[PDB]
Amino acid sequence: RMMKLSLIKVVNGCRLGKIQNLGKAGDCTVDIPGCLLYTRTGSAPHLTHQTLRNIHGVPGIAQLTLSSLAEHHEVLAEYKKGVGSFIGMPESLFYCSLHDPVTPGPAGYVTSKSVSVWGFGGRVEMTVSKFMAIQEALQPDWFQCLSDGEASCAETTSIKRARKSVDRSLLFLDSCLRLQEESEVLQKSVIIGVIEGGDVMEERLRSARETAKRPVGGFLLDGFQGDPAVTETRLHLLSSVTAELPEDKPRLICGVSRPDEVLECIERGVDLFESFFPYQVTERGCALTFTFDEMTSFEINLKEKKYQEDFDPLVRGCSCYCCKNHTRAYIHHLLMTNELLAGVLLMMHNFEHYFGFFCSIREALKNDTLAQLKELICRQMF
């Protein structure tokens, strides 16, 4: 409950559908497969709430991260009306992840009693009760449960480390559920259970099976993120895990946002992705250009002099604010003259492009043409 996931069809393991009645007011509808708006603190990077509304296709749910907010627990707790109200958008929908995928901290601070996050001012150690107190201050519609995602950070794959991540995460889960039952302000918030177990198949499946026994609203597939992309072994692990999860609850994944990875994960039953990739592209002065009808092959770098006299838009036929009004040469000029407006403009285009890519995925699932889209993406990446 607390949301209604309906599937239109499942083509080659890809789940095409929508999640209805979600959020604290139970009135938002999200399409799947889909992404969440990437933010750190609840406000989109570079973008006023009004400017964000000038981007086409903005997702119905925004991500914010405990990493960046945990230091401000005292202010938000005294304020008590929640993050949405704090930023001047009470009607917004928020999923609160534990970590910022763009800037994760060092490994090795997880114990059976606490998990640490790193914000702008440094490290914050969270017991279960400290973590739930923060959630009571933030009041997100969805929140990732406190979890141990560091089994794969060990030098080798060991049963003991994988087993511990499963058991720690279930202990955290049952404790947070208990504290949520006793909380006036978290009654309409939904906890997301976290699948752990590292690279050990049996512990992965046990984590999936045990987590699904709890009344979580959905599941976060944790620990599959790859450099540069999810490895083939972890894709196999992924579809084994999703096969054990109930079909009527959404599957989220963290740390997976690049278009080729996204498609591999959709094929293996993942529904919802973080959109930090276009933010990373913006931060290095780049624009996403890949067609869907370190810097990657999906993008151009507007700092390069070859764009100083390129009076074409970032993407021809793009209708974002930047491509409606500006050229490559202009954006290059803004970067050269060190005008921060460049970051605003790139963020608008990169979000709009990335969200359009997800719209295109869903159309491909409808038309049963996903395999051609996938080859199109991977031809641009090589």
Please give the residue ranges that form the binding site for its own copies (CB under 8 A). Answer: 40-41, 43-51, 54, 68-69, 72, 75, 78-79, 86-88, 119-121, 308-309, 311, 321, 325-327, 329-330, 333-334, 336-341, 343-345
Q: How many residues bind Zn ion (CB under 5 A)?
A: 7
8 A C-beta contact, residue 275 and residue 59: yes
Strands 114-119 and 122-127: antiparallel
Say whether residue 287 binds Zn ion (CB under 5 A). no
Q: How far is CA 199 from the centre of its chain?
A: 21
8 A C-beta contact, residue 185 and residue 139: yes
Nearer to its own copies, 231 or 308 (CB): 308
Minimum gap (Å) between residue 338 Cβ and Zn ion: 22
- Report the distance separating Cα 341 and Cα 349, nearest Å: 13
Nearer to its own copies, 164 or 326 (CB): 326
Neighbours of 361 (CB within 10 A): 26
Say whether residue 323 binds Zn ion (CB under 5 A). yes
Q: Which stretch binds Zn ion (CB under 5 A): 170-178, 251-259, 318-326, 366-374?
A: 318-326
Specify the residue for token string 């979000």: 351
Say whether residue 256 binds Zn ion (CB under 5 A). no
Neighbours of 360 (CB within 10 A): 18
Residue 157 interacts with, from Zn ion, its own copies, none (CB under 5-8 Å by kind)? none
> Preceding residues of all breaks in the chain (C to N beyond 2.5 angstroms)?
293
Nearer to Zn ion, 114 or 327 (CB): 327
* 145 annotated ligand binder: no
Minimum gap (Å) between residue 136 Cβ and its own copies: 17
Nearer to its own copies, 129 or 308 (CB): 308
Cα three-residue angle 147-271-194, rounded to 5 degrees: 10
Residue 48 interacts with, from its own copies, Zn ion, none (CB under 5-8 Å by kind)? its own copies
Nearer to its own copies, 247 or 311 (CB): 311
Q: Is 295 helix (H, G, I), strand (E, B) or coil?
A: coil
φ/ψ of residue 238, rounded to 5: -60, -50
8 A C-beta contact, residue 320 and residue 352: yes
Say whether residue 19 binds Zn ion (CB under 5 A). no
Closest CA to 292 of 334, 259, 333: 259
Minimum gap (Å) between residue 314 Cβ and Zn ion: 5
Minimum gap (Å) between residue 120 Cβ and its own copies: 5
Nearer to Zn ion, 219 or 354 (CB): 354
Minimum gap (Å) between residue 81 Cβ and its own copies: 9
Minimum gap (Å) between residue 46 Cβ and its own copies: 6
Q: Mark out the alpha helices in the chain (DSSP H runs).
A: 49-53, 66-69, 73-79, 83-86, 128-138, 159-181, 201-212, 232-244, 259-267, 276-283, 321-325, 328-336, 341-366, 370-381
Q: Nearest 10 degrees: CA dihedral of 274, 275, 281, 283?
A: -80
Residue 320 interacts with, from Zn ion, its own copies, none (CB under 5-8 Å by kind)? Zn ion
Closest CA to 32 of 19, 49, 13: 19
Say whether residue 326 binds Zn ion (CB under 5 A). no
Q: Which stretch binds Zn ion (CB under 5 A): 40-48, 186-194, 257-265, 342-350?
A: 342-350
- Report the distance separating Cα 165 and Cα 163, nearest Å: 5
Question: What is the sign, positive or negative, of the torsion defined by CA atoms of 300, 301, 304, 307?
Answer: positive
Q: Which stretch binds Zn ion (CB under 5 A): 27-35, 130-138, 195-203, 348-356?
A: 348-356
Minimum gap (Å) between residue 329 Cβ and its own copies: 6
Residue 326 interacts with, from its own copies, Zn ion, none (CB under 5-8 Å by kind)? its own copies
* 14 annotated ligand binder: no
8 A C-beta contact, residue 91 and residue 61: no
Please select the residue that binds Zn ion; options are 349, 351, 361, 377, rule is CB under 5 A. 349
| DSSP, res 317 | T
Residue 133 interacts with, from Zn ion, its own copies, none (CB under 5-8 Å by kind)? none
Residue 168 interacts with, from Zn ion, its own copies, none (CB under 5-8 Å by kind)? none
Q: Which residue ranges make up the annotated binding site for Zn(2+)? A: 318, 320, 323, 349
